Amino acid sequence: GPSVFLFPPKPKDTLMISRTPEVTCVVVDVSHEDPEVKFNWYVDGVEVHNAKTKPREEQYNSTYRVVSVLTVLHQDWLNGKEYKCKVSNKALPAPIEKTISKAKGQPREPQVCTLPPSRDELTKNQVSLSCAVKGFYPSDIAVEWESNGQPENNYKTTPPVLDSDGSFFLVSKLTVDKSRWQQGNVFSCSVMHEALHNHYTQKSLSLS
Amino acid sequence: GPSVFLFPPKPKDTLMISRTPEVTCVVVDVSHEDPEVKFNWYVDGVEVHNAKTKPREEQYNSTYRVVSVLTVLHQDWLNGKEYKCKVSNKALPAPIEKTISKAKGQPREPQVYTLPPSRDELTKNQVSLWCLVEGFYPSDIAVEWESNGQPENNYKTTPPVLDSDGSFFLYSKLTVDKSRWQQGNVFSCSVMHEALHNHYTQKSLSLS
Ligand SMILES: *[C@@H]1O[C@H](CO[C@@H]2O[C@@H](C)[C@@H](O)[C@@H](O)[C@@H]2O)[C@@H](O[C@@H]2O[C@H](CO)[C@@H](O[C@@H]3O[C@H](CO[C@H]4O[C@H](CO)[C@@H](O)[C@H](O)[C@@H]4O[C@@H]4O[C@H](CO)[C@@H](O[C@@H]5O[C@H](CO)[C@H](O)[C@H](O)[C@H]5O)[C@H](O)[C@H]4NC(C)=O)[C@@H](O)[C@H](O[C@H]4O[C@H](CO)[C@@H](O)[C@H](O)[C@@H]4O)[C@@H]3O)[C@H](O)[C@H]2NC(C)=O)[C@H](O)[C@H]1NC(C)=O
Ligand SMILES: *[C@@H]1O[C@H](CO[C@@H]2O[C@@H](C)[C@@H](O)[C@@H](O)[C@@H]2O)[C@@H](O[C@@H]2O[C@H](CO)[C@@H](O[C@@H]3O[C@H](CO[C@H]4O[C@H](CO)[C@@H](O)[C@H](O)[C@@H]4O[C@@H]4O[C@H](CO)[C@@H](O[C@@H]5O[C@H](CO)[C@H](O)[C@H](O)[C@H]5O)[C@H](O)[C@H]4NC(C)=O)[C@@H](O)[C@H](O[C@H]4O[C@H](CO)[C@@H](O)[C@H](O)[C@@H]4O)[C@@H]3O)[C@H](O)[C@H]2NC(C)=O)[C@H](O)[C@H]1NC(C)=O
């Protein structure tokens, strides 16, 4: 029988009005037999009609894969609406239903703090700048660095970590050339989270 | 039939000579029809005979659980020797063999940096002290906080994060009363890792 995998939007997509959050319903192991696949979509049990389904695509294992994509309204996802994908196929005993929704829990607003390099590390070639984000809930969050109007990619961010008070924290470490910090370039940590005003805050850091 | 799980020593136990590192071989789903389990232990393929096996213990699913514990020599573990557990049971077609050893790879020394709280934060009643540990390999590590020789264990530490040069980093966040910080008490981050001199370093942090 076919199997169904239901995927959520990316957090950043739900937090920025100009992005396009989508829920993706993927069906695999569709037979030659019985290649017809029907999608029904429901939001809080109410059927919706505007999903965009793709033609089936045969895989190297001689089975078909078919994807239906539902664009969601940012505020619907953030308000906890439940998205159900129902998949019908003649080779199935009964239609398969999957339902997905945003992580639950009372939201808590992240506090964001930039931390300059240790004075030990000024003799290293590069320095590490630190963006600590603490006290947030739920754990879905996006953290990004930039400078002079361009993204700075040479960073890594820890997973969210459950703190003692039940909130999450993480740290993002941006590595830059020392000269470039000496220089006095300003670096900025952008944080996107449902519990922030405008779902966005930025903190900047430069040599003092 | 039964399942076997093989667990390494704690990092701290392998790194401090006074402590006692053990490898633990756990057998679950030992049924009453076949309750007798044989453990054969090997170090680099050579059988050793000093493991201690402890009385089988009856779980709430009525099945059993038998545990053998092998004491390891610190330098054997650190030099990459392989520890093999072989579990023999009547119910089992052939004995199950599990092998474990230290995480492989060329060691790299942790760089340890303490970062004071952000000024932003001085308005709460608690402050966050950070201990940034970067550039280390393998990921086995222990990170602890103390003040005046005593454990401060009101802290949380991120998991190791694979960094863009293939080494690891993490942060440990210690939360303390603002008063303790304001009054100048000294706090210390201690790190234990195989690539450190004496497997140990400490870095302290205080207000001017
Ligand atoms: C026949 O072949 C098919 C097709 O496979 C391909 O072709 C074959 C011939 C080989 O060449 C394969 O190597 C090829 O890939 C096989 O189909 C596979 O079946 C698996 C089940 O049997 C299924 O496993 C499940 O995978 C889930 C994760 O899927 C993610 O991540 C993987 C990488 O790990 C990636 O390959 C998948 O495509 C999928 O990727 C995500 O897709 C979603 C939807 O597009 C993305 O979300 C969207 O992203 C956009 C932006 O891009 C936007 O934000 C939207 O808002 C958002 O919705 C998402 O970004 C992608 N992520 C990544 C990282 O890429 C697992 O979660 C799942 O686990 C669950 O179930 C397990 C049991 O099955 C449990 O153990 C577990 O606990 C979980 O509950 C499964 O592991 C494969 O995904 C599926 N492959 C594809 C391509 O569909 C088929 O199996 C095979 N049949 C036979 C008989 O051999
Ligand atoms: C009947 O019941 C038993 C017992 O069930 C428990 O008790 C009952 C009363 C209920 O409460 C249950 O809910 C309880 O679980 C069932 O036994 C279980 O079988 C599972 C297999 O089906 C097995 O899953 C595997 O777990 C591995 C990790 O186990 C860790 O962590 C869990 C907690 O997350 C813990 O339950 C285990 O005890 C074990 O804990 C470690 O123990 C070692 C050994 O002592 C510790 O290491 C030693 O510690 C000492 C100090 O204590 C000292 O430091 C030594 O130096 C050191 O050696 C270690 O500290 C403990 N770690 C932690 C984190 O606690 C997984 O890794 C494994 O995954 C692997 O396989 C997967 C696929 O199978 C893969 O995804 C993956 O990649 C891995 O390869 C499995 O998931 C359960 O552990 C096991 N539970 C116990 C207690 O043994 C039994 O199955 C059930 N029967 C039936 C029919 O259901």
Residue numbers in the entry:
A (entry chain B), B (entry chain A): 237 to 444
What does the paper say about this structure?
Educt molecules are knob-into-hole heterodimers of one half-antibody-like productive side and one knob or hole dummy Fc. The dummy associates with the knob or hole Fc of the productive side (covalently linked by hinge interchain disulfides) and thereby covers the CH3 interface.
Different mutations built into the knob or hole dummy chains lead to limited repulsions within CH3-interfaces, yet without affecting expression, purification or biophysical properties of educt molecules (described in detail in subsequent sections). The implemented changes include reverting in CH3 Cys354 and Cys349 (KiH interchain disulfide) back to the parent residues Ser354 and Tyr 349 on dummy knob and dummy hole, respectively. The charge flip partially destabilizes the CH3 interface by replacing the 357–370 Glu-Lys salt bridge with equally charged and hence repulsive Lys-Lys or Glu-Glu pairs at those positions. Limited reduction of hinge disulfides initiates an exchange reaction between complementary educts driven by their partially destabilized interfaces.
